[PDB]
Write a protein that binds this ligand. Sequence first.
Ligand SMILES: Cc1cc2nc3c(=O)[nH]c(=O)nc-3n(C[C@H](O)[C@H](O)[C@H](O)COP(=O)(O)O)c2cc1C
Ligand SMILES: Cc1cc2nc3c(=O)[nH]c(=O)nc-3n(C[C@H](O)[C@H](O)[C@H](O)COP(=O)(O)O)c2cc1C
Ligand SMILES: [Cl-]
Ligand SMILES: [Cl-]
Lengths: 410, 409
Amino acid sequence: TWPDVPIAAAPGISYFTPAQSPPAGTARNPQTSGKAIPKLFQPLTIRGHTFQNRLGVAPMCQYSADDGHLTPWHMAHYGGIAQRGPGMIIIEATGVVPEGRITPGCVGLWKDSQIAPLKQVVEFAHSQGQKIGIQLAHAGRKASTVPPWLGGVTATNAVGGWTENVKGPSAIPFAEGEIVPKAMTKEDIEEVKTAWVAAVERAVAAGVDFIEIHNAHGYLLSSFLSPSSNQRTDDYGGSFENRIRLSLEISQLTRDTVGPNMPVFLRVSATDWLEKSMPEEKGWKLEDTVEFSRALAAQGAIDLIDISTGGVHAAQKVTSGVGFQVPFAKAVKEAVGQKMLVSAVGTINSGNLAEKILNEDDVDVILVGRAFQRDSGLAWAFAKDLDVEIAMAGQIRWGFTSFRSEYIQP
Amino acid sequence: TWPDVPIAAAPGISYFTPAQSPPAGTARNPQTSGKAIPKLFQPLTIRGHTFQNRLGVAPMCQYSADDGHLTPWHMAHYGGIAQRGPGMIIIEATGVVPEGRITPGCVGLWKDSQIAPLKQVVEFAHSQGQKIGIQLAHAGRKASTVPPWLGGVTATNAVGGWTENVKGPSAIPFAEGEIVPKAMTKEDIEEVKTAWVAAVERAVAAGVDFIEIHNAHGYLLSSFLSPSSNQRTDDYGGSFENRIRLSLEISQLTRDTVGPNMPVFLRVSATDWLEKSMPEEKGWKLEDTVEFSRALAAQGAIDLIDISTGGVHAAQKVTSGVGFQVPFAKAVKEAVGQKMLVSAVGTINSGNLAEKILNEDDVDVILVGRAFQRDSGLAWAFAKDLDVEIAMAGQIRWGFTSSEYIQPN
Ligand SMILES: Cc1cc2nc3c(=O)[nH]c(=O)nc-3n(C[C@H](O)[C@H](O)[C@H](O)COP(=O)(O)O)c2cc1C
Ligand SMILES: Cc1cc2nc3c(=O)[nH]c(=O)nc-3n(C[C@H](O)[C@H](O)[C@H](O)COP(=O)(O)O)c2cc1C
Ligand SMILES: [Cl-]
Ligand SMILES: [Cl-]
């Protein structure tokens, strides 16, 4: 006596959940308003993948991993964001070796047991049509510390640390009183590259849509760049060519393992923020980052440079503020044009400023961090900031619309 | 060389996650600002349990369960809320029998396999210091329908329905053209009572902190109250006492089963909204809800009456607006003073308005629905609107300051 109305399910998974067609965060085309779609909510395609808008979740450590293994905290964290249509999600820094975690709570992928917890989270994200990738990491001489809400102080062995297995380019503590890392041997560098392939391979089995390389914030790769942390006298220190070499190798290796269709990102710290505080230190400035991005666009393996700053030197003096890292992303996009995409991140907390950055600075992707801890639906917020009628999950949307559309007029 | 700093873990569980001392959403007492803590952020104790503030997540159907089983959808939903410190979480309407779900995607607790999926979510919430309970339900003559984003129309058997196993007090479809429900036999009600007791035990086995009885919104118990849906001629129909009889039995059975320490809530539809649209209809109005709340206060089984409205009759005309069901809770609170707790729900979108309802309408709990689907961190939102310094998870809190507490303004 009634028509048959089925509930379409997400494909390829062992549990039922409703499918969202199109995925949450997709601008209706045509907009019901008749207005043009702002640059922020126009899809972007990198190699084999399409992101339905250009707002990404910046990688954010949760310090809640159990021997590198994801827990239901990460299902609640990443999954609540995934239900609300960001354009992409960058999973937090994930250790490629145990001594490459930052803290005892860091995610890791040095082990096959670590794949399936990550795979459960990726799988639910894709049940939502969301794109999810992972930032592989090696904390270097900044490894073995406690989470930041506990001050970020050294994690001793009694409390889970590894103060005797901390490795960097050179025997230089990050600050006085911090762990003196062991200057990595050539075999250590070869061991890190070897572990890097295994971690990339482990991520690929888990189903990630892209890989980001953590080359920023004074961790292992970032510290090879800076002559403040790198005083090696071999093929990996001294000259500018040598200090970007390991970063260049990891980029080729990472490309070579994922093939020609998978997006590969690299995040770098554009400056060490010593311009005023330590002007006589030959460190790492925007000029160095621009020459670095020139080698990476020339090399052709990395698709997107994620520009961050600082963490490279303890004496940094960070000039914070709204969008305080956009100037560096603007200059790097200027250096590489369309050969490389560039993303911006850092105190970008309105949709209007996000759109302003994409158009006036020619940035490709807008990443937001903290605000996604506060607003798991920040993509919902930025669309409202921009008045974009967007798609949202049928479970969420039906109480924000009339009794009788797949899109939300925010 | 270096001081020893361990990361305390949540106790009694097989996975590491940082412990939250105090649970998120706890107003610092005393506030560092010296200001007083509003009632919305004053803890609440019901029998064996203490809630760290009075903001609750109202029950909200997700229509995404797998043969009644919770999925990672529910861990992302409830668990993302749980990280952000509400005073309580009321899990959605949970069917006690298969045919008592609303839709094929509704949760259930008629079967033992459904406990462990529930237990993973309750166990993650409790890792955060969260209080979490469940709304048990039976969709009645409004059962076997599709989710609301697909129109809420009948679900035929071809798409997962059970159009021949839909039961209510009387064989009266909810609207014209809808499924004609089967009029329950004496055995039908006893099977519900048997099924209800078992579902309580399954909920208690899953570890919930409280149970709410869904007696609202035109589902099974709501349809027994209203003479529009209930024309029975036995102990469950006719007189007003007969129409509230089943609700009274169900509440005591739950009380006897959960023991003396567990809070038991009951949600009711305070009015059917037929005053203007069907004025000559003997239906269910606030005067009945007050006599029912008085009878439940006399009984002593239920600790909190969850006041809602509507869903009881198809021609309802709901005059909505900000705090639009607050008047009914205000009259019910007056009739039951301190013998029973009372909550209010409905288009309550700021901490300022919430506090206002608490203080001069004297309700005990403020429930919010939609606003939690948008902001899983609404407890943070209402704390800022009221300038209340609250505790927040160390994973969330450390990027908004240079303490365990966050000054939200
Ligand atoms: C809690 C938290 C965790 C973070 N984890 C990482 C990380 O694992 N890797 C990384 O490159 N940056 C990390 N960051 C830095 C952010 O990804 C981002 O670049 C920075 O927060 C941008 O500023 P915003 O959060 O104010 O938008 C983290 C930041 C926060 C607040
Ligand atoms: C998506 C959604 C699902 C709901 N599911 C239930 C439910 O299962 N049981 C119930 O008693 N009320 C349910 N409600 C009603 C809410 O609990 C609440 O009483 C009502 O929505 C008013 O809350 P609000 O105005 O803050 O959204 C639901 C509401 C929404 C929007
Ligand atoms: Cl970082
Ligand atoms: Cl409902």
